[PDB]
Amino acid sequence: ANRVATLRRRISELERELQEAEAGHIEVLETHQAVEHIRDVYNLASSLRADFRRVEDSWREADRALRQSIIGEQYHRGDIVERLLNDQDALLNTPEGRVFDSFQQQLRQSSELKAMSERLRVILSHPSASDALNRLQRHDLRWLVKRLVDE
Amino acid sequence: MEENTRQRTENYISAKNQHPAWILLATRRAPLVLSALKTLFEKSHDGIPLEEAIQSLSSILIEHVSQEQYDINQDNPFLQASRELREWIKRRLIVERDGRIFATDALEVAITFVESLDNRFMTSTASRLSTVQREIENLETRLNPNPANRVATLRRRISELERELQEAEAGHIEVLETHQAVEHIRDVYNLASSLRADFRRVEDSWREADRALRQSIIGEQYHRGDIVERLLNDQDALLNTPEGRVFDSFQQQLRQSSELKAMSERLRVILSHPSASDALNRLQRHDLRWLVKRLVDESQTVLQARARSERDVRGFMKTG
Amino acid sequence: MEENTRQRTENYISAKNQHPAWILLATRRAPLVLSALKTLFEKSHDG
DNA sequence: ATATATATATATATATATATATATATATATATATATATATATATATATATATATATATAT
DNA sequence: ATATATATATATATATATATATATATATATATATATATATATATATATATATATATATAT
Numbered sequence: 001a002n003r004v005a006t007l008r009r010r011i012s013e014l015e016r017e018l019q020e021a022e023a024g025h026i027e028v029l030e031t032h033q034a035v036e037h038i039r040d041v042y043n044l045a046s047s048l049r050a051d052f053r054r055v056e057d058s059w060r061e062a063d064r065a066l067r068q069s070i071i072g073e074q075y076h077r078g079d080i081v082e083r084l085l086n087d088q089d090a091l092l093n094t095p096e097g098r099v100f101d102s103f104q105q106q107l108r109q110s111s112e113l114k115a116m117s118e119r120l121r122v123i124l125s126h127p128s129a130s131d132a133l134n135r136l137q138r139h140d141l142r143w144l145v146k147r148l149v150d151e
Numbered sequence: 152m153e154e155n156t157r158q159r160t161e162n163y164i165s166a167k168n169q170h171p172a173w174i175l176l177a178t179r180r181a182p183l184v185l186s187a188l189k190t191l192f193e194k195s196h197d198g199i200p201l202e203e204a205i206q207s208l209s210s211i212l213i214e215h216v217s218q219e220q221y222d223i224n225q226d227n228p229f230l231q232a233s234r235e236l237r238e239w240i241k242r243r244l245i246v247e248r249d250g251r252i253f254a255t256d257a258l259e260v261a262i263t264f265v266e267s268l269d270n271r272f273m274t275s276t277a278s279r280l281s282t283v284q285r286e287i288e289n290l291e292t293r294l295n296p297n298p299a300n301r302v303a304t305l306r307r308r309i310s311e312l313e314r315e316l317q318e319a320e321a322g323h324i325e326v327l328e329t330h331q332a333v334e335h336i337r338d339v340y341n342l343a344s345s346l347r348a349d350f351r352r353v354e355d356s357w358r359e360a361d362r363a364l365r366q367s368i369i370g371e372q373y374h375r376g377d378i379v380e381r382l383l384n385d386q387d388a389l390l391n392t393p394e395g396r397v398f399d400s401f402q403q404q405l406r407q408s409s410e411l412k413a414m415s416e417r418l419r420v421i422l423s424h425p426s427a428s429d430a431l432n433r434l435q436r437h438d439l440r441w442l443v444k445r446l447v448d449e450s451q452t453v454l455q456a457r458a459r460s461e462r463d464v465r466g467f468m469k470t471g
Numbered sequence: 472m473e474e475n476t477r478q479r480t481e482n483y484i485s486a487k488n489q490h491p492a493w494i495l496l497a498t499r500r501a502p503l504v505l506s507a508l509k510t511l512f513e514k515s516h517d518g
Numbered sequence: 519a520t521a522t523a524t525a526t527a528t529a530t531a532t533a534t535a536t537a538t539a540t541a542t543a544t545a546t547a548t549a550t551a552t553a554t555a556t557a558t559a560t561a562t563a564t565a566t567a568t569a570t571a572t573a574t575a576t577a578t
Numbered sequence: 579a580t581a582t583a584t585a586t587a588t589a590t591a592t593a594t595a596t597a598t599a600t601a602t603a604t605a606t607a608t609a610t611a612t613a614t615a616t617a618t619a620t621a622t623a624t625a626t627a628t629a630t631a632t633a634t635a636t637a638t
Contacts, residue, residue: 003324007316014312018305026298034294036397041290044342045283051275095272098334102277116284119291126294134152136513147516156510163502177497179549179611182483190476214477222612230539237540268493269486434472499551499609 034128041123042133042141049144052151055096062091103148117145171243171257172264180221182265187211188239188254189262193434196441197448198251208232256352263348274341276334282342329426336421336430343442349394350449354456356394360385361460368467375468382464402450415443 020026029037066087070080091097106113123129124138133141140147167173175181191207192199199207209232216223224231236252239245246253254262267274292304318324327335364385389395405411421427422436431439438445487493495501 004316004319007312007319011309011312011316014305014309018302018309021298021302021305024298026296026301027293028296029290029293033400036393036400037290041283041286044286045279047275048279048283051273051279054273095276095334095337098277098330099273099275099279102280102334106280112284116287119287122291123287123294139516143516153510153514156506156513159509160503160506163506167502173496176493177501177610181497182487183480186480186483189479211476215480233539265483265486265493268490269482 031128034126035132038123038129038132042137045141045144048148049140049151051096051099052148055100056151058094058096059091062087107149113145117143120144171255172261175242175244175257175261176265183215183218183221184239185261185265187215187235188244188258189266192254192258195254196445197452198249198253200251204252205229205232205236208236253351256349256355259348259351272337276338276341277331278335278338282338327426329429332424332426333430336427339421340431340435340439343439346442346446347449350453353394353398354453356389356392357453357457357460360389360392361463364460365463365467378464378468385460398450398453402454405446405450411443418442 066084069075069083075083092101120141124133124142129138167177175185178184187208190211191204194207209228212223212231212235213228216225219225236245240247240252244255244258246255292301295301295304364381390399418439422440427436487497495504498504
């Protein structure tokens with residue numbers, strides 16, 4: 001019931017916005033506030049790269065551990081398969097693991113990542129983007145999705 | 152562009168030789184001092200009284216006396232604490248202000264760096280992408296001035312919410328899995344916490360602007376009538392300086408009683424939920440619980456900090 | 472709370488001799504190295 | 519009831535002496551960074567030798 | 579018939595010297611840090627020394 005009420009108020013809110021927009025009284029971000037509002041999304045999203053920079057390292061270390069452990073003579077085949085499954089699941093269980101898993105889940109519904117990339121492409125075209133970010137930062141954000149996929 | 156690349160090296164040399172945080176990180180005893188300071192302010196609501204800080208620092212020194220290689224005192228904790236705190240104020244790292252002590256922005260950045268340096272929980276969560284998606288979704292739908300695009304966007308959003316409402320009416324809803332909630336709580340904490348990170352850079356913007364004003368006045372022959380308009384010109388100049396401008400807009404939004412009260416209520420119900428206790432230790436939850444109070448009071452403090460410059464007009468103009 | 476006040480100093484002490492970034496930042500010649508590397512990596516996301 | 523002259527207590531300033539904490543100027547030990555010696559590893563130049571595809575000539 | 583032998587120039591690999599470039603270790607020189615000594619700011623005093631004003635006397 002609480003979710004129903006929340007949606008009943010949100011639908012009314014968006015309907016009021018629709019009524020205003022249909023009345024020709026659409027409103028943009030104050031062109032000057034746009035610079036800060038874009039710097040906001042840039043800084044906010046800048047974390048993801050700093051997070052994959054460590055997801056990669058965690059999985060590399062997991063693989064190296066699996067190597068140095070498989071040498072063990074005490075280990076037999078059943079030990080090795082078990083250790084593989086356990087190591088991968090445990091890595092996936094850590095926070096960075098859940099980050100990677102969520103990113104992966106996004107790919108199954110690529111529509112959303114592609115929509116995000118398209119929107120970012122549109123955003124950086126707007127003139128204010130040039131003031132907020134230099135060419136380098138725009139170069140990153142325009143292809144953040146690709147840089148994550150590649151990483 | 153890359154013409155500035157030649158000058159950037161000189162800029163970094165300047166930062167290395169003068170900036171407080173960087174100089175701190177280069178000291179032979181940097182980790183001990185930084186850890187002590189971190190612990191001291193880790194418990195703050197606002198500026199800590201001098202004596203509360205002295206007691207806490209002296210107790211902490213006691214805990215770390217075993218690090219004897221650094222000539223750490225072993226017979227006098229209060230004297231050592233007072234000496235160290237005086238020195239750190241001399242290091243431009245904390246402020247002799249109003250009987251309390253506050254963290255200089257340099258300390259804030261050094262804390263953020265080192266605390267984000269070791270093996271730890273990362274700066275992000277599995278929910279960061281969803282937040283970014285929503286933020287871009289709003290940024291585009293609001294930057295777009297084409298009313299047709301806006302009305303179509305609203306047409307589709309209203310349809311999605313209509314689907315949700317119909318689904319709930321039929322008796323179907325969805326909720327977060329436990330660890331999903333953990334990640335979302337951590338995301339909330341990471342976001343909201345950053346709001347505090349820049350108050351005492353705005354404070355320094357005001358301080359530098361005021362000191363620049365009083366410093367340029369060394370031309371004792373200046374026609375004092377200029378300040379009749381400079382009273383507005385300083386405000387305008389800092390209203391385009393991103394610090395003052397953004398802080399002013401932040402106040403404008405921070406005055407929306409309904410929204411802040413609702414956000415506080417939502418934070419309360421969130422912290423009450425069991426998953427909250429798992430995502431964050433009691434200290435973090437206590438910090439977030441009253442967050443709105445902290446922001447209100449810190450903004451008011453920064454206001455009363457700029458207040459000093461506000462009266463400076465009469466102090467400059469008049470004589471007798 | 473109390474546990475961290477003693478265990479954390481170990482984390483920073485180790486980081487001061489284990490993590491490359493901090494090891495670099497304390498060096499005499501840090502800004503030159505950091506600027507040069509930034510310039511190199513500024514213009515090429517591919518390496 | 520007002521308007522002045524009345525002796526003194528209260529509260530205070532200050533002083534040389536003591537002490538104690540803060541700030542400045544210095545010396546010595548620890549750590550850093552560069553330079554050097556030496557050894558060792560890389561690659562290249564020269565020439566010798568290895569092996570190969572085909573030539574030239576022969577087998578039943 | 580189709581198949582075979584050695585012999586040729588062919589490119590390729592290999593041994594060895596030349597200098598160079600890299601790596602490791604030692605020593606010297608350099609800079610940070612903290613210690614020690616001197617002086618100054620701060621607090622208190624035992625007492626002098628005091629101004630102010632009250633509490634206070636006087637006048638009409």
